[PDB]
């Protein structure tokens, strides 16, 4: 039952990651190379997370499946609104991850519970950063050059990390 | 109109790549580390291909979209059957790529035509290899150890290559 | 009371470790150098675990005792059966470790609870590996050479690590 | 509400840290360079802990405040009595940290819960050492030279460490 | 009597230093990493000053005490107002230091008088800098990016420096 | 028949080694790091000896078994009494080893006789040292600091040494 929720999380993460590529590609086309570079990177790290969940099920000889990925959002009024979706998403992932921890606790699946511990910390950091990008984006008017300057200056995964 | 077909190919490639992860994870769970390591790699290179198509539309200031990904196959009777799907898939991708070339030629889109040239050559090699893995898999009975030994011994993409 | 269960675990781990030596020496006599080398190593790492528990009680100025060790199994019908005992044992250790975590949680011993967290993760990996050795051993008939090739290719502790 | 208790802990830790400086300065004046050097260091590491708490609230975009610091003890009958206060203090900090863990658990604040995990382990070690200094101090009569010989021989922080 | 005033200065300096941390943490939460980094550093150097005074009393075998620290200001309307408090504070510290020099002169405490000489020079520089940060902050509108770029581009102490 | 006595010696040595861990852990808890460090090491070297015996039977294709280990002593009135047990133990091991040599001589087992030769020499040295630690321990009153200063200043094994 925590197993079923973990599978679903693999799906969520693959989706989340795809959404990042979409966001990265959006920035790339808006000639925001720095933001783009970052979210290209961000998408890869999210893929890593997925593969870490895959790996956990593998290690526990539980059934695992590589899911499809939902359509993701490709059109944005402006860079800030994209950064917003990214923060909003990371906040959601944090919820999902919290819930997994809860379920594992309830089922007294101690292995699952500790395995989620790292993810919780990672989420604190991902949210912290998306939040910062949004604030700084707000501070920079349609002066995206400022946003771009700012970005420029400031468990085992199945397959490897990349 | 070649533009539309190129978008659809971005979707195909992201799908194809996902299917590789599925195959990789399958091998990984069957304790076939060498096969698995390879297809994990294979899936990343396919992702690269997708991103190369993304990059092409970017460079031409044509609309581009990061698609969702179809469900992919996760269960196989045996390693050979998975290798089969991979060959079968790469053959299909070759078709799609040929068809893109044809459409570009027909529309006299000389930029699109030349951009596809590299992909044609890549497909020759990808198919050549999947084909080899299938033959060798056939030669090795249920003696997968032999298959494993064998594997062990023998354009700008948006984001970068991995 | 979690203290009592921790002492007992020190005993279990020393025992587990001894059983590995036994398994290692069995392989060694069967002219399975690779398997043997690994389980000699495996036994040392288990000893390390014991000493990590010793160290925890030391750091908490709680009474600790170096136990004796129960007789362990020395005769096996065949390599596979040995690897089996090893998996079976690591599964048991995981139980013990989970139960410790539970007891500490119940007693609201927050120090004990966190200290166990590492051990949970380690067990996920030890089990994952013994399981893999068993599957591969199954795949290899009485063709132990294949088993051997495969193995060849693929908290603070009191007194330190080894 | 765990947030409130966390703020209060930042205050506690700054206080604790200051008390160490006091202890270090005491030793310094007693011409106990080794003990002094150590507690100067100890005070810095405590400051680090405070800044790690500051950093956690920062990362979670929760309100954080740099508190004042209570008067700390400056006069001691003799080195042993200072070392005593230090052990007694570290034991108290351990309580506070446990309590935080408890509250986070109760409120099901999974992020706070995991973030506290490191601090629990650190406290095991700080207490272990203060306890050792007291025992050895006891063993050394007013023969402080022996105490001195002994000492000589044997999460992100807002700002950095030092 | 200069001794009494020196003790009080130890208190002032510890307080001043704490106020810097507050200012640093404020900037940090406003996503002004450069300003923050600098004032984190600034707070450490102020701590150093305190410890230098501690050391002076130590060297003269005069009674010294590690004081508590007053509450410091944590909320600011905007970065400029914080920089203001910082300048204002350093000017005050300069007064205190001057007054110490005066008292020592009056008491004909030649040792205290010379020991203060270094602190006078340091204050000239600290004030010079806080003043510069304020002017530049004025010049930069709510364009804090400019303030940030600017900062980015442009005796013995008890325990040691840090 | 010398073969039976050799097996029993493997048991003795594993026991002896465990007893050293006990002694090491005792010292560790008494805050005698140097003594502890040494006997941790000493226990490993004893384990080595056991494994050297295992190796001899392995090399001679004689049946060998990894034994359990008897309870060992964990409580001591004071450091000297522990050092005593250690000397007393090594003297006992020397007897056992002599007796093995004798039996091999009687049975005219020339291979066993020579293999024992090294162990005789090693015992001369182990006893020589335990004896020295006892004398020095006697010389040092309850002044253990002196004991500690002193310690600080002054065949194939199945699986390898440590």
UniProtKB/Swiss-Prot annotation, chains A, B, C, D, E, F:
It catalyses: 4 Fe(2+) + O2 + 4 H(+) = 4 Fe(3+) + 2 H2O. Keywords: Iron, Iron storage, Metal-binding, Oxidoreductase. It holds the Pfam family Ferritin. Fe cation 2 binds at residues 46, 90, 123. It is an enzyme of class 1 (oxidoreductase). InterPro entries: Ferritin, Ferritin-like, Ferritin-like_diiron, Ferritin-like_SF, Ferritin_DPS_dom, Ferritin_prok. GO terms for biological process: intracellular iron ion homeostasis; iron ion transport. One of its GO terms (cellular component) is cytosol. Fe cation 1 binds at residues 13, 46, 49. The keyword Metal-binding applies. Its EC number is 1.16.3.1. It comes from the Bacteria. CDD domains: Nonheme_Ferritin (cd01055). GO terms for molecular function: ferric iron binding; ferrous iron binding; ferroxidase activity. Homooligomer of 24 subunits that are packed together to form an approximately spherical molecule with a central cavity, in which large amounts of iron can be stored. Iron-storage protein that displays ferroxidase activity, catalyzing the oxidation of Fe(2+) ions into Fe(3+) ions, that can then be deposited as a ferric-oxide mineral core within the central cavity of the protein complex. Belongs to the ferritin family. Prokaryotic subfamily. This is Ferritin BfrB.
């Amino acid at each position: 039952k925590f197993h079923a929720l973990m599978q679903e999380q693999i799906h969520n993460e693959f989706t989340a990651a795809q959404q990042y590529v979409a966001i990265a590609v959006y920035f790339d086309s808006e000639d925001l190379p720095q933001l783009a570079k970052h979210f290209y990177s961000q998408a890869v790290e999210e893929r890593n997370h997925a593969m870490m969940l895959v790996q956990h099920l593998l290690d526990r000889d539980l059934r695992v499946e590589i899911p499809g990925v939902d359509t993701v959002r490709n059109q944005f009024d402006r860079p800030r609104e994209a950064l917003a979706l990214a923060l909003d998403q990371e906040r959601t992932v944090t919820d999902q991850v919290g819930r997994l921890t809860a379920v594992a606790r309830d089922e007294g699946d101690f292995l699952g519970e500790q395995f989620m511990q790292w993810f919780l910390q990672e989420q604190i950091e991902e949210v912290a950063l998306m939040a910062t990008l949004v604030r700084v984006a707000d501070r920079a008017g349609a002066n995206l050059f400022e946003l771009e300057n700012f970005v420029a200056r400031e468990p085992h995964a199945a397959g490897g990390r990349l």
